[PDB]
Amino acid sequence: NSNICEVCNKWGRLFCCDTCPRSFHEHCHIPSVEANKNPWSCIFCRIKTIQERCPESQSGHQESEVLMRQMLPEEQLKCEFLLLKVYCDSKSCFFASEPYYNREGSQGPQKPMWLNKVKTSLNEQMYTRVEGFVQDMRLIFHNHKEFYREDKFTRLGIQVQDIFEKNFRNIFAIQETS
* Structural contact between residues 2 and 21, judged by C-beta atoms closer than 8 angstroms: yes
Interacting span for Zn ion (CB under 5 A) from 13-21, 77-85, 114-122, 131-139: 13-21
Count of residues near Zn ion by CB under 5 A? 12
Beta bridge partners of 70: 129
Interacting span for Zn ion (CB under 5 A) from 28-36, 103-111, 131-139, 167-175: 28-36
CB atoms within 10 A of CB 28: 21
Cβ 51 to Zn ion shortest distance, Å: 10
Interacting span for Zn ion (CB under 5 A) from 20-28, 73-81, 84-92, 126-134: 20-28
Establish if 8 lies at the interface with Zn ion (CB under 5 A).
Answer: yes
DSSP string, 137-165: HHHHHHHHHHHHTTSTTHHHHHHHHHHHH
Establish if 86 lies at the interface with Zn ion (CB under 5 A).
Answer: no
45-84 footprint of Zn ion as x/- string (CB under 5 A) = x--------x------------------------------
Interacting span for Zn ion (CB under 5 A) from 21-29, 60-68, 88-96, 147-155: 21-29
Among 16, 20, 50, 163, the residue binding Zn ion under the rule CB under 5 A is 20
CA distance 64 to 97: 29
Question: Counting beta carbons within 10 angstroms of the beta carbon of residue 50, is it exposed (0 to 12), middle (13 to 18) or buried (19 or more)?
Answer: middle
Q: How far is CA 16 from the centre of its chain?
A: 21
CA distance 79 to 122: 8
Residues engaged in binding Zn ion (CB under 5 A): 5, 7-8, 17, 19-20, 25, 28, 42, 44-45, 54
